[PDB]
Design a protein around this ligand. Structure first.
Ligand SMILES: Nc1ncnc2c1ncn2[C@@H]1O[C@H](COP(=O)(O)OP(=O)(O)O)[C@@H](O)[C@H]1O
Ligand SMILES: Nc1ncnc2c1ncn2[C@@H]1O[C@H](COP(=O)(O)OP(=O)(O)O)[C@@H](O)[C@H]1O
Length: 203
């Protein structure tokens, strides 16, 4: 089974993907996590990607397409989490999968309003060593766990990221709808309820 998780930043895509991957044995491919590792390592990809990420812009498509070609799991279940982010990326994914006799089985759209997104992102904190994600209100880290706020989770960058999502990423809703594989999630609900909805789709 191949899944794509699609929706605004802060919808809870990563949170749900990590849980589904561990509980059911999917390989979790998060372009954001992979990009952050590249930036930390100072690879050619990381060095180039860094300034786009800092500004809240998308990293250029060709970089992302190459990355996915490089890390694509050839067998087994996969969750693409925050990829594709543009129509060109989605077209490239379809072509990759078709060469392998595969297809995207379900695209889960995590629907959530802007006000909720902004609260989710503003309160997001991460363990920079493990990538584990917390929220100051809805899931605070326990004692002993050092967290930071992502620089792109500051107010002005959130604003930019939501604009970018609406312009470049939201068209994927229609792209996948017209393949007949889109499934809608209410990602504004609490974390357990969102997970129930995810399970309902894949079952
Ligand atoms: N259903 C939810 N209700 C409240 N907070 C949530 C929910 N899902 C995730 N969170 C929190 O909201 C923020 C965004 O979640 P995250 O999984 O990073 O989203 P995405 O991967 O879609 O950007 C994090 O701070 C996370 O702890
Ligand atoms: N598929 C992608 N295409 C282009 N840029 C990406 C992609 N995935 C992640 N990024 C870059 O990484 C940044 C953070 O993305 P991500 O880690 O998915 O965080 P969030 O869950 O808050 O959207 C994006 O704003 C963009 O700069």
């Amino acid at each position: 089974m191949i899944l794509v998780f699609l929706g605004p930043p802060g919808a809870g895509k990563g949170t749900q993907a990590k849980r589904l991957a561990k509980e059911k044995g999917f390989v979790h491919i998060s372009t954001g996590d992979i990009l952050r590792e590249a930036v930390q390592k100072g690879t050619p990809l990381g060095k180039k990607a860094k300034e786009y990420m800092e500004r809240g812009e998308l990293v250029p498509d060709d970089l992302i397409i190459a990355l996915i070609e490089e890390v694509f799991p050839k067998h087994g279940n996969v969750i693409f989490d925050g990829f594709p982010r543009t129509v060109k990326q989605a077209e490239a994914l379809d072509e990759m999968l078709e060469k392998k006799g595969l297809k995207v089985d379900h695209v889960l759209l995590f629907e959530v309003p802007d006000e909720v997104v902004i609260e989710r992102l503003s309160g997001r904190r991460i363990n920079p060593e493990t990538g584990e994600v917390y929220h100051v209100k809805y899931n605070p880290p326990p004692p002993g766990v050092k967290v930071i706020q992502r620089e792109d989770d500051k107010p002005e960058v959130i604003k930019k990221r939501l604009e970018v999502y609406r312009e470049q990423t939201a068209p994927l809703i229609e792209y996948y709808k017209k393949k007949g594989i889109l499934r809608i999630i209410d990602a504004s609900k609490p974390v357990e309820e969102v997970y129930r909805q995810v399970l309902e789709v894949i079952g």
